[PDB]
Amino acid sequence: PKRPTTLNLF
Amino acid sequence: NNFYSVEIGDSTFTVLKRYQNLKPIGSGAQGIVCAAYDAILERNVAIKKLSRPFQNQTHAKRAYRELVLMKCVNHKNIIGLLNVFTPQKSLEEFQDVYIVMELMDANLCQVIQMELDHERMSYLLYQMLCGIKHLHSAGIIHRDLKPSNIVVKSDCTLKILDFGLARTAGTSFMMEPEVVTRYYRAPEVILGMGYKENVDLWSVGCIMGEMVCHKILFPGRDYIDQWNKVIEQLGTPCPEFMKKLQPTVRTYVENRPKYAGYSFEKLFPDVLFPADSEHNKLKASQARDLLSKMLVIDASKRISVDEALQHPYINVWYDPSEAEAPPPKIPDKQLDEREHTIEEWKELIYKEVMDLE
Ligand SMILES: NC(=O)c1ccccc1Nc1ccnc(Nc2cccc(O)c2)n1
């Protein structure tokens, strides 16, 4: 399992 | 001089020209906080203006620890201190302290207004939990966690914020148990009992829940209705807990209606949780289980920080370096119960703010 790298903040 | 000024509302910032083109982004309590571009740095930064650095014997104690702690505590999950200064020339003139920190895209409220998937929500929660831990490893409690004090970045990293109310152990039930933000006060705080490390863990619950439901968990029309919203939810705490309450509080608490409470399956029906996969650790079941171990009225029974970092929903991200990091070290200068004079303080704020840049 790998760590998330993106996060939509709109 | 070197500094300058800009009209930021009914106030004014006097900063080093290295920080250019300001704009407000936060109407907090320790002061307004502007987002600006540090030319020398070539990275946009955050600046906090400290309101009346020593107005009341109280605003000092906090504005101080903020500084101190801002300094003595460094962790990848805790807003890094970039700079501090003061447009004033000398003591007799001194009366304003500016704080420059890294700068994140947004506040957790932002996440709460969007759907996450396990991976995300679990990673964030993880990060959040690492930040706290590091603090706790020094007996340092935050006392005031909430969306408002948590920030994210386009790359999905979490960073803790604010240390005004930050303090240690917890001699008793403080003086003004109002200072902590309502919706997130933990039973020990509401019923004025005296907090332990895990008091933060409760706030963490209120947060995750909010992140799940998209609305505040335990609302509350006032300082007292708060307790009501809590029990109507988890149900009246058991006698063992009552017995731990002060004699006056005890009475009142027992005179309330007897609420049973609702099962977490109904407080957070599987749907509300990010769509489950097939994976076991990252499952609504597990996520829901953490909650139940944090949203506990009797603190003595509320999952400690580590226990959280080890729980199956946050476990998949564990890494010694981040979790088991080395304890930060505060000199012994900073006290959370000490008491000086408006002036006596004014000095320690300089002789600190000074040797800081
Ligand atoms: N006391 C503070 O440090 C404070 C109070 C209120 C609001 C922010 C902040 N601080 C802060 C620090 C770094 N990055 C952001 N990023 C950010 C961006 C957009 C909206 C936000 O709410 C925050 N905000």
Got the DSSP string for B306-332? HHHHHSTTTGGG--HHHHSPPPP---S
Report the C-alpha gap between B348 and B67 in whole angstroms.
Answer: 11
Q: Judge whether B28 is annotated as a binding position.
A: yes
Q: Provide the residue count of chain A.
A: 10
Q: Which of B264, B291, B299, B65 is nearest to B190 (CA)?
A: B299
Beta strands in chain B (DSSP E): 6-7, 12-13, 19-20, 24-27, 32-38, 43-50, 81-85, 97-101, 106-107, 140-141, 150-152, 158-160, 167-168
Cβ distance of B119 and A7 shorter than 8 Å: no
Residue among B106, B155, B282 whose CB faces A6 most closely: B155
Q: Does domain B1-105 have CATH number 3.30.70.20?
A: no
Residue among B156, B279, B282 whose CB faces A5 most closely: B156
Contact status of A10 with chain B (Cβ, < 8 Å): no
Q: Provide the residue count of chain B.
A: 357
User: Which residue ranges does chain B devote to CATH 1.10.510.10?
Assistant: 106-325
How close, in Å, is residue A10 to chain B by CA atoms?
Answer: 8
User: Which residue ranges does chain B devote to CATH 3.30.200.20?
Assistant: 1-105
Contact status of B282 with chain A (Cβ, < 8 Å): yes
Contact status of B109 with chain A (Cβ, < 8 Å): no
Residue nearest to atom 7 of ligand 1 (CA): B26
Enter the resolution in angstroms. Answer: 3.2
Beta strands in B120-252 (DSSP E): 140-141, 150-152, 158-160, 167-168
Strand-pair partners of B140:
B168
Helix (H, G, I), strand (E, B) or coil at B157: coil
The CATH architecture annotation of domain B106-325 reads Orthogonal Bundle (1.10)
